[PDB]
Design a protein around this ligand. Sequence first.
Ligand SMILES: [Ca+2]
Ligand SMILES: [Ca+2]
Ligand SMILES: [Ca+2]
Length: 637
Amino acid sequence: AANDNNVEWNGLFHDQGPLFDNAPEPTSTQSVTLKLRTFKGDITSANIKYWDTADNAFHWVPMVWDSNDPTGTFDYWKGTIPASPSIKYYRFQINDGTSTAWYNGNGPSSTEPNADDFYIIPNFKTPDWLKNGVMYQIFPDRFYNGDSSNDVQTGSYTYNGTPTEKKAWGSSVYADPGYDNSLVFFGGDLAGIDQKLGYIKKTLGANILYLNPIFKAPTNHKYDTQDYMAVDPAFGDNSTLQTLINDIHSTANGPKGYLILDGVFNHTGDSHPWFDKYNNFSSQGAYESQSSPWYNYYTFYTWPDSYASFLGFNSLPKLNYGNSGSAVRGVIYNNSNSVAKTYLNPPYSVDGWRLDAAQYVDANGNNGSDVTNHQIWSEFRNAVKGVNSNAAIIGEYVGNANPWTAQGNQWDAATNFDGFTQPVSEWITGKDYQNNSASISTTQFDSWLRGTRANYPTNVQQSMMNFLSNHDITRFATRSGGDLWKTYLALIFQMTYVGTPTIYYGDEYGMQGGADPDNRRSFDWSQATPSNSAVALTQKLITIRNQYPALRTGSFMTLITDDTNKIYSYGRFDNVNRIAVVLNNDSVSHTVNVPVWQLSMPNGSTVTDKITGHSYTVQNGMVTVAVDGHYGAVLAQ
Ligand SMILES: [Ca+2]
Ligand SMILES: [Ca+2]
Ligand SMILES: [Ca+2]
């Protein structure tokens, strides 16, 4: 508010949204112009300090006043970082007389930060459809039986001395005596998904489907791959897949769609012919002979019974990637007929891969998270983007996936357990995604989100897979104790946050389910109608997100973190829209005075709460709205 030897943190702001960065994903020849907000006439000077990897040294860029905002409450200072192909990191030093403050990915700070700087990664690009879309994850056998003929009957075949069991739709997933939970088949197939595309792309509005493993394998989940080149018979054939894909891409049944498949490349099943532990093929697998033409595809500590695998499971033998140019790297991604390229090239042309157990991929039985692992994912990116520059690569990882993203040479994003799923679960349900006691306050929730977003470059942030639940954790509906309102609150946050909203089939209507396999129940189609509370809401929220680009690629600013009333408010905004989201995590309603002036919403202007449909007028830079307990408001203009 004045030159008083004091920098006012509350007026400061910067992130890589359109209002503050003119080149979020620049090439080697494009310079980056940055803008820093501050209260009007609050400072005397500001400087951009960036580290250049080409140089291994810091560089200084003095900023200059640029303009005021429409309300005349803030100033905007600007400075430009020169164009080059090198990766750079930056922070701001802000001065008002004898007062200095710093600011970077983690926000304001009195002392100079050493971590969490903003990222500039020349030529790094993540597909924009991923940034702007809504994903729907489907576990094939449990979504919808489109063709009951290809169904696996209770006794169709045996695996490791066990018959497969068919269950009636709606039945419990747990196997009956004499059977195994990994061999229970409810009947869902690709044909079904194809027939329910209308529900997916219209009723709900999602434009991206992500399917759990669909290739030939003996189990329910099918992560124990037997043949990467063939759609498993229980789901259909490769022609079925091609028809599904065509209908997904079609714009005659709704919005243009995108298909992402699960790529299990760290290991194969023990029944794959390269290994052939049960001798299901005339050929000789690695387990069968040390003279096998694929012996070197695996790592044996004591041939043939002790070998490298996924988390000690003997049914999942770990592939040996060797050095660059190896046969394994060839059949997985380098060869034209490899697994990755096959489905990315016509007649399939899928749109991306979700990398199962990505962190472990390595050579010689080692456990990844090393030089070799990253070199492999680097070669993987070149192979993929070489076929389709718009194909997405999302790696599975439960923590900070910075190591596979921040260099802009590996994945486009990752499964956001650490930056979305966990924090949300603990704030709303008082439990972690495992269903164990773990609760955080509103201030901790906000801190958690900011810290995790800071781990990633902005384009990676906008491409993260944000799901409330999935096939490896407990259902949100169960962690919430069956309280639908908690689901309401979660959906609203999900559809308005930074990252790709991902709906784990069933979650949109409150489906319950405990730990695997209880988290893989069949889909009750009598609940998949707007007549259902959660569904109607999901459809509305998806419509809201698709209506406002600020929700997908706009800036993010915290507006309120009230621990007593449990009120969380944040804004999403770009050059066109300004949206203030108000969430009520309490068990009783609260009337909140939203500080929309922080988003520069003009006084006397109006906003509409997209959740209730009610309209309001900005008075004294505020918006007073009564929000019901465990519910929210989306105030936009
Ligand atoms: Ca001042
Ligand atoms: Ca079927
Ligand atoms: Ca054999």
